[PDB]
Each structure stands twice: as structure tokens, then as C-alpha cells.
């Protein structure tokens, strides 16, 4: 599924991400924009053999099982395919664990490089939420 911006903002809010760990909704929407372009089906191979999955590009070394990532811990206890679903619940539940891992949203390099410090409220501007 390719979400619209406000549609994804609403779905994220519906799943408890607004201000989760202190990160406002616009931070999450911004991260999803630059990780996946709002496409739940996005997958991208990393240099190290792991793969990133879904709206928030969650990896298979630490967080989900894809069966092909040596050393996989599967800390979200889910198949990586579950992170490609139209229903963002699994991606949200796992993201909540990731952002609680110690470094906040810096876990997403694209958030650090493209969202952090910016006017992230712009991502929710105009949205009926």
C-alpha cells in the first residue's frame, strides 16, 4: 500500500506513535517518507547482507526474521514479511521497540540526516487528525 501523507499521519496516530518516546507525529511521518516513500512494500538490501522492510525500513539482523540474515536476533519476534502489510500495526509495534533501544530515532539514519532538527510539523500540516 502507498499511503498518502495525512492518511499515514492518521494511521500512525491510530496506533499510538504520536509523541511516542517524545517524538511528535511529524517526525514519524518524515522518517517514513524518506525510508519508504510511504510504501509498505518497500524492501532494500544492505551492504552487510541484511534487508530493510516496510514503511520504516526495519532490518533483518536485529529486528525481524527473513531466514537469510546470519546472526538474526529477531527482537520484534516477527517475520520480516509482516512488515510489508497494508496494516501498519506490526511495523508500528516494532518501531516502538527500536526507538526505545537507547538512541531514539537516530536508529533511522535517514531520520538523523533528513528529519532531525527540521520543521517536521510541516509533515502533518493541513491534516484532519
Residues belonging to the active site: 35, 52
**Number of residues engaging Cl ion in binding (CB under 5 A):** 6
Would you say 102 or 117 has its CB closer to Cs ion?
Answer: 102
Would you say 55 or 124 has its CB closer to Cl ion?
Answer: 124
Picked from Cs ion, Cl ion, none, the partner binding residue 79 (CB below 5 to 8 A depending on kind) is none
CA distances from 117 to 106, 112, 121 (A): 12, 8, 11
Closest CA to 57 of 27, 19, 98, 24: 98
User: Number of C-alpha atoms within 13 angstroms, CB side, residue 120?
Assistant: 22
**Candidates 26-34, 39-47, 48-56, 69-77 — which segment interacts with Cl ion by CB under 5 A?**
26-34
**Candidates 63-71, 85-93, 94-102, 112-120 — which segment interacts with Cs ion by CB under 5 A?**
94-102
Q: Are 59 and 42 in contact (CB under 8 A)?
A: no
Closest CA to 116 of 37, 25, 55, 27: 27
Cα separation, 18 vs 8, whole angstroms: 12
Cell numbers standing for residue 38 = 510511504
26 binds Cl ion (CB under 5 A): yes
Binding mask 41-80 for Cs ion (x = CB under 5 A): ---x-x-----x----x----x-----------x------
Q: Is 119 annotated as a binding residue?
A: no
- Residues near Cs ion (CB under 5 A) are 19, 44, 46, 52, 57, 62, 74, 101-102
Amino acid at each position: 500500500k502507498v499511503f498518502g501523507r495525512c492518511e499515514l499521519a492518521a494511521a500512525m496516530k491510530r496506533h499510538g506513535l504520536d509523541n511516542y518516546r517524545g517524538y511528535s507525529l511529524g517526525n514519524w511521518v518524515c522518517a517514513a517518507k524518506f525510508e519508504s516513500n510511504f510504501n509498505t512494500q518497500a524492501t532494500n538490501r544492505n551492504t552487510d547482507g541484511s534487508t530493510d522492510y516496510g514503511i520504516l525500513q526495519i532490518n533483518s539482523r536485529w529486528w525481524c526474521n527473513d531466514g537469510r540474515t546470519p546472526g538474526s536476533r529477531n527482537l520484534c519476534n516477527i517475520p520480516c514479511s509482516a512488515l510489508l502489510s497494508s496494516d501498519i500495526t506490526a511495523s508500528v509495534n516494532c518501531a516502538k521497540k527500536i526507538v526505545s533501544d537507547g538512541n531514539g530515532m537516530n536508529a533511522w539514519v535517514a531520520w538523523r540526516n533528513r528529519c532531525k532538527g527540521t520543521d517536521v510539523q510541516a509533515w502533518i500540516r493541513g491534516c484532519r487528525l
